[PDB]
Design a protein around this ligand. Structure first.
Ligand SMILES: Nc1ncnc2c1ncn2[C@@H]1O[C@H](COP(=O)(O)OP(=O)(O)CP(=O)(O)O)[C@@H](O)[C@H]1O
Ligand SMILES: Nc1ncnc2c1ncn2[C@@H]1O[C@H](COP(=O)(O)OP(=O)(O)CP(=O)(O)O)[C@@H](O)[C@H]1O
Ligand SMILES: [Mg+2]
Ligand SMILES: [Mg+2]
Ligand SMILES: [Mg+2]
Ligand SMILES: [Mg+2]
Ligand SMILES: [Mg+2]
Ligand SMILES: [Mg+2]
Lengths: 304, 302
């Protein structure tokens, strides 16, 4: 035995901080990395999907391809940008069916057409399990990160919350038959759609923005932390879908818990004066930026 | 039922890439980097991967792996006529890996970025069983140079010397406690290859076809040849050999020519153009010619 500090002890964000300092980096910290180029800003970002962690080999491949692109396009949109070019690095087992990869890219192709971006390259390496690393390049006239929230700002989110988590739980049940609303939830988990419809809004009005990937509470703390402010959320303001309620009804669950802690919805979390609100978009006011520290819900403070 | 469906192993690496290209209806895929039109210039996107047990061992000096991680990708950018700008590094890391490993990896990354004048602006972290390193690089150029432009009559050049890296890998594999200075040089060339950043202008201005030598001379020359629909004739006696490589072969009874022909990971350059565009102030060596036909030949044989 020797005892040496391991990554596990440091923790995810502790490691990122170490990386940021070692690099003496000033840009690291947001969903994307803004770089100055031709009077505009290019946004560089990357996400990963590993077999056994974010999907199973039994998952429909085209959906996995759709998701791989969507997941990263989500970061770009959350920071006020439009996707442009992407590369996909694949770690593949030599026993995998050729049709799997082909179908994965069919899903990638459809997502790219939908988001109006393009996969221009990538890499292939041999491995035990499937690993998917996506690199995306986007552009914007105004980058919006996690540290620009202003006190008095209202806190917004897009769509509904908790759907993805319920979808995953339903998939885990491995039932041989699901009801329509259950398939809807499963589809939302398996095939999320990045809110590319919010780009202009974020780019023009948000003071602080990011996408909800790990859950509202957890991601709201990063926002509150980087903006050095306090976030007060009202549970009864959380946008809930009928399918989620139906799910929580059938399995004796509490919707609010799914809305606050459910991950992988890939909706947006942004802030700005309530007056900038756009009723044409499905945004919902759920709280506000108050001078202070931490994230509070109905008064009590909740940590990630 | 029975599964008779084709598996990746059967199809092969390049056959897979062709299928991927076809599926995306992509016109750009195929070269070391991907050129995209932007701001009256050409941005170059590219990605390489270093996986534990395959491209390196966890026992290798971390900072060297960090240096190489950046260097191998910058090499692709350089080989297609561009300069590196921004990079992202996605890491698959075992939760029980020493933090010192990661910090030292990034010290190597930092040093390479300062040397090549580019910057790591972000990345990703994921839990895994083994260390996985995926680097993404963005470069920029005024003139993109791919692998399909070789014109007949062109001379075939390479930079530096060849076979050094393979010699270095073999020395590493001997797991000796101490190496002679010349052996450390060889090891240095395998562990910490220096991308040919000094060739950017030359490649950008006068190369009709270019790429870096990573798989090996003959192996990569073959790609250059089929991509250009030309045949490449190389003369072994012209291959650039280093004193330390020759010293190595002398000591271990090896043939420096084989190393220069098949040795991988030197990350030197392979490009073609008229003999008159030769620049004596760069260490390029003419090793062959571009003629009509197909395939790669060495001293007459395929
Ligand atoms: N999963 C993937 N998706 C899309 N394109 C891919 C890909 N894997 C590889 N490619 C593309 O096919 C071509 C070859 O990439 P490859 O990684 O084999 O070579 P390389 O040019 O990086 C040289 P090296 O030996 O130096 O690594 C590139 O144009 C690349 O973008
Ligand atoms: N190995 C690495 N090297 C450099 N930067 C890294 C890194 N791993 C993560 N980062 C950076 O730290 C910040 C966080 O990345 P992270 O991948 O955890 O979040 P994310 O913003 O992509 C949200 P999500 O939950 O949606 O995936 C980013 O600015 C990222 O570029
Ligand atoms: Mg994000
Ligand atoms: Mg990420
Ligand atoms: Mg993300
Ligand atoms: Mg290359
Ligand atoms: Mg590559
Ligand atoms: Mg390469």
């Amino acid at each position: 035995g020797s005892f040496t500090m391991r990554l596990k002890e440091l923790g995810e964000f502790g490691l990122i901080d170490l990386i940021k300092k070692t690099l003496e980096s000033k840009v690291i910290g947001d969903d994307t990395a803004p770089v100055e180029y031709c009077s505009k800003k290019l946004l560089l970002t990357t996400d990963v999907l590993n077999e056994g962690v974010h999907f199973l080999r039994s998952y429909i491949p085209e959906a996995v391809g759709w998701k791989a692109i969507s997941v990263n396009v989500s970061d770009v949109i959350a920071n006020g940008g439009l996707p442009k070019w992407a590369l996909i690095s694949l770690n593949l087992p030599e026993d995998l069916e050729v049709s799997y990869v082909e179908r994965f890219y069919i899903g990638v192709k459809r997502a790219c057409e939908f988001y109006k971006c393009e996969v221009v390259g990538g890499n292939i390496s041999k491995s035990e399990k499937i690993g998917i690393s996506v690199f995306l390049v986007g552009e914007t006239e105004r980058f919006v990160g996690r540290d620009g929230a202003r006190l008095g700002d209202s806190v917004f989110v897009s769509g509904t919350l908790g759907d993805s988590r319920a979808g995953l739980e339903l998939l885990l049940m491995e039932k041989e038959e699901y009801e329509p609303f259950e398939l809807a939830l499963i589809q939302r988990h398996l095939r999320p759609t990045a809110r590319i419809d919010y780009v202009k809004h974020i780019q023009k009005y948000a003071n602080a923005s990011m996408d909800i990937s790990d859950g509202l509470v957890a991601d709201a703390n990063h926002l509150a932390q980087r903006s050095g402010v306090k976030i007060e959320i009202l549970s009864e303001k959380l946008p809930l879908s009928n399918e989620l309620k139906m799910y929580c009804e059938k399995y004796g669950k509490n919707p609010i818990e799914y809305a606050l802690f459910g991950g992988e919805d890939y909706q947006l979390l942004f802030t700005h004066p309530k007056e900038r609100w756009n009723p044409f978009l499905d945004m919902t006011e759920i709280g506000r930026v108050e001078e202070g520290e931490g994230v509070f819900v109905d008064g009590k403070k909740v940590e990630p």
